[PDB]
Ligand binder design. Structure first.
Ligand SMILES: Nc1ncnc2c1ncn2[C@@H]1O[C@H](COP(=O)(O)OP(=O)(O)NP(=O)(O)O)[C@@H](O)[C@H]1O
Ligand SMILES: Nc1ncnc2c1ncn2[C@@H]1O[C@H](COP(=O)(O)OP(=O)(O)NP(=O)(O)O)[C@@H](O)[C@H]1O
Ligand SMILES: [Mg+2]
Ligand SMILES: [Mg+2]
Lengths: 387, 387
C-alpha cells in the first residue's frame, strides 16, 4: 500500500509540478490573433492542459533568465527564437551555451560520464539557482522546469554550443531514454531545446486538431509577446521566425484592449524604488480605463514570469483607490493594467509561479508611483463613476 | 555552478513546496477568536510564514484523509485532537494506526531496517496516494506533506499504535537525524505527530511573541473548526482538548459573519449530482447576503483542504448571476458563501493545494443547485441592488 516514487514517475502523475495533466478550464486563458496587420489578445474559451502550456513556459523563462544573466556581460543574448510547427516546440537563445564539461558529482551519482547539459536537462533539483541570491531576479529557482519539459516529451533534443564545441543529446520517452551526447568542434554559441509533447497523454488529438493547433499557437505567440516587453532593449523575440513587435508595456496594453477600447488613452508610469536592490529594478506600467471593462484585470510579467496574483498589484490598486475616494468625495473595476519588470527577493506559492509572495511593506517602504499617473488614472475613473 | 540538491536541502530553501519560508502578506488570512461564549472569525492583518501554517495543515489534512478512508469501515476515526502549547504542535487521530511492519523496498534503499511509519514520515514521494484512484476524495496525493512537517521541525515525535504494538520514533533537526524507533506491546490504536517548528528560521521570535502565539493559535483553531464542518457525523474535532462546535456550514457561515451581519438570514442548500461518482458527494452550502459586504467572499473546504480558488465557486456565482440579471431586469459582491464537501477527480496547481483544477463542464453536466436557494439568494441580492 505504501509506495515510493522516483521523480519521473511522480511528475507524470502529479499536478503539483506543472498543474493539471489533462484539459481543465483555465480562468483568463488568452492568446494573440492577427487580424489584418493588427495584433489582438483574445480569450480562449476552451479547456486546455495547464502542464502542456507550462513546459512551453519553462523553456521560455529559461531563455529570459539567460538574457538577464548575460545582459551586463560581453557576450549578451541578442535573440530568443520560439517555434511551433507540426506539434514540435523549440526555443533557441544565443549568448554563452551551457558548459560542455564533465560534471564530477553527477558522473559519480550515475556511474558513467555525465556532462553539465545532461545535469541541466535530466537531473531533478539541479541547476545554477539552487543557492539563489536574495537579490536574484531570474525566474528560475528550483532546478526542475527543464526536467518537466523532458518528462512531458515523446522525444526531445538538447543542442548547445560554447564557441569551441557543439553538444547534441536526445532525451526520449518521457526521460526514460537518455542517449549519449554527440560532441563536435563548432564556432557557434547558443542553446536550443526542441521537443514533441505527449499531446495524447495530456488529452489532445494526435495529431493536434485545427482548433487545438490554433489555440496553442495563439497562446505561445502571446507568451512570446510578453517576453518581448520584459527582455532588455538589445534582445529580439521571434515566433515562427517573425519578430514580436511588442517591445513596450504600451504595445502590450494596446494588444489586450484593441477590440474592447480602440483609440484609447494609455496612462503610463515607471514605478521606482529608493534603495538597492529595489532601485536597480524600475517597473513599467501602462493602464487603460474604460466603462466597457467589467472588472479589474492585470497582466504582470515579473522576473520573466506571467504572474496572475501578487502584492505588487494590490499596492497599485490601494494607491489608486485612496486617490479615487478622495477625489470622488470632493474604484478599480474599470482598469486594465500591464506591469512589467524585475522584483528582487520574491518567493512563489509553487513550481508553476502563478502567485508571488512578499511583504506588502516592501512597496509601502521603498516604491513610489508617479503622481501624474495617479492623477490621470483618478480623473478617468472619477468621470466614469460620475456618469 | 550547476549544483544537485537532495529533497531535504531543497525543501528548506525553496518556496515551491509549502510556500514562502519567511513572513509575507497572506491575503485573506483569518483566525477565530472567542468573545464571551461567541466564536468570531476575524482577519489577521500581520505578515505570517505560509510554510509554517502549511505544516499544521499537512498534519490536519492527513488526519481528515484518514477519517475519510475509515468512515465506511468497522474501525472508524472518532476524533482528531489538535494541540498548540508552548510552541509545540500535535495532531492525533484514532482508528487503524500506520502499519508497524518492515518496508522491504525502503529497507533495501536505506541499507537498514525501515518500518512503514518511517517511510510515511521520512521518505519523500512516498505514501498510500502515489497511485490515486480517479474517484478518490482524500486531499493527499503527493507523498510529501508529512516530510515537509518533519523538515520544518527542530524535533518531532511520530507515535502510532495498531492495537498490538506501539511505535515511537524521534525525527530531529529538520529530518537530519532519524532515531531508531521504540516498538512495544500495546492495545491502543491511534496516530500522533508532535513537533516543534523551526520558528526562528521562518522569521518568528524564539520563543513566540504574545501576538505571534495569539495569531497562530487563532489560525489553528479556525482550521480545526473548518475540519469539524468537513468530517463525518461520528467524528469530533478538538483544539487544546476543547471540542470544535462548528459541525455545519451554517455554524461556519455564522462564525465568519457574526461581527459584520449579526442576526442575519442564512440561505442553505445541498448541491447534488446526477451520476456516480459525483452523486456520492453532496456539497453543503450556507450563504449570507449583506449590503455591508464589500466584495464576494467564499470559504471552500473541499476534500478536507481550504481551497481559495476553484471552478466550483465560479459555477455557483454564474448560476446566481444569471437569475439575478433576469429578476432585476423584470450581482455577487454582497455574498459570503461557505461550501463544504468532497469532489472526486480534482487536480491542484501545487503541493499547497490553494487552487483546484477541473473542467467547468463537470458542474454544468452533473450538478444542480436547488431552485429554493437560488430564489432566496436572488430576492436578497435584488433588494440590495434596488436600494
Ligand atoms: N535556455 C537556456 N540557456 C542557458 N542555460 C539554460 C537554459 N535553460 C536552462 N539552462 C540552465 O539549466 C539549468 C536547469 O534549468 P531548469 O531545470 O529550468 O532550472 P532553473 O531554471 O534553474 N529553476 P526552475 O525553472 O525554477 O525549476 C538552469 O539553472 C540554467 O543554468
Ligand atoms: N494521521 C495519519 N493517520 C494515518 N495515516 C497517516 C496519517 N498521516 C499520514 N499517514 C499516512 O502516511 C502517508 C504519508 O503522508 P503524506 O506525506 O502527507 O502523503 P499524502 O497525505 O499521501 N500526500 P500529500 O499530503 O498530498 O503530500 C499517507 O499517504 C498515509 O498513508
Ligand atoms: Mg527553469
Ligand atoms: Mg498528506
Amino acid at each position: 500500500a505504501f509506495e515510493i516514487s522516483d521523480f519521473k514517475e511522480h511528475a507524470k502523475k502529479k499536478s503539483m509540478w506543472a498543474g493539471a495533466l489533462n484539459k481543465v478550464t483555465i480562468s483568463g486563458l488568452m492568446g494573440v490573433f492577427t487580424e489584418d496587420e493588427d495584433l489582438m489578445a483574445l480569450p480562449i474559451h476552451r479547456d486546455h492542459c495547464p502542464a502542456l502550456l507550462k513546459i512551453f513556459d519553462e523553456l521560455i523563462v529559461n531563455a529570459t533568465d539567460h538574457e538577464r544573466a548575460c545582459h551586463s556581460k560581453t557576450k549578451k543574448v541578442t535573440y530568443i527564437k520560439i517555434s511551433f510547427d507540426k506539434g514540435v516546440f523549440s526555443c533557441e537563445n544565443d549568448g554563452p551555451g551551457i558548459p560542455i564539461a564533465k560534471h564530477e558529482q553527477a558522473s559519480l551519482i550515475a556511474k558513467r560520464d555525465v556532462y553539465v547539459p545532461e545535469v541541466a536537462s535530466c537531473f531533478f533539483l539541479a541547476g545554477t539557482n539552487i543557492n539563489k541570491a536574495k537579490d536574484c531576479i531570474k525566474g528560475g529557482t528550483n532546478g526542475v522546469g527543464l526536467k518537466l519539459a523532458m518528462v512531458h516529451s515523446q522525444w526531445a533534443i538538447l543542442t548547445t554550443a560554447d564557441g569551441a564545441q557543439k553538444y547534441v543529446q536526445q532525451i526520449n520517452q518521457r526521460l526514460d531514454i537518455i542517449e549519449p551526447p554527440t560532441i563536435t568542434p563548432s564556432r557557434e554559441m547558443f542553446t536550443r531545446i526542441e521537443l514533441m509533447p505527449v499531446y495524447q497523454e495530456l488529452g489532445y488529438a494526435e495529431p493536434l486538431s485545427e482548433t487545438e493547433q490554433a489555440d496553442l499557437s495563439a497562446w505561445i505567440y502571446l507568451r512570446a509577446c510578453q517576453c518581448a516587453a520584459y527582455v532588455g532593449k538589445g534582445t529580439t523575440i521571434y515566433y515562427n521566425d517573425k519578430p514580436c513587435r511588442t517591445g513596450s508595456v504600451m504595445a502590450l496594453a494596446k494588444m489586450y484592449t484593441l477590440l474592447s477600447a480602440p483609440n484609447s488613452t494609455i496612462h503610463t508610469a515607471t514605478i521606482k524604488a529608493d534603495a538597492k536592490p529595489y532601485s536597480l529594478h524600475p517597473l513599467q506600467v501602462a493602464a487603460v480605463v474604460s466603462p466597457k471593462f467589467k472588472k479589474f484585470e492585470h497582466v504582470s510579467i515579473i522576473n520573466g514570469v506571467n504572474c496572475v496574483k501578487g502584492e505588487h498589484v494590490t499596492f497599485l490598486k490601494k494607491t489608486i483607490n485612496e486617490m479615487v475616494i478622495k477625489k470622488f468625495q470632493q474604484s478599480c473595476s474599470n482598469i486594465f493594467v500591464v506591469i512589467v519588470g524585475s522584483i528582487p527577493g520574491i518567493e512563489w506559492t509553487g513550481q508553476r509561479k502563478d502567485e508571488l509572495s512578499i511583504a506588502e511593506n516592501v512597496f509601502k517602504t521603498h516604491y513610489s508611483i508617479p503622481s501624474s499617473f495617479l492623477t490621470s488614472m483618478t480623473r478617468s475613473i472619477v468621470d466614469i463613476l460620475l456618469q
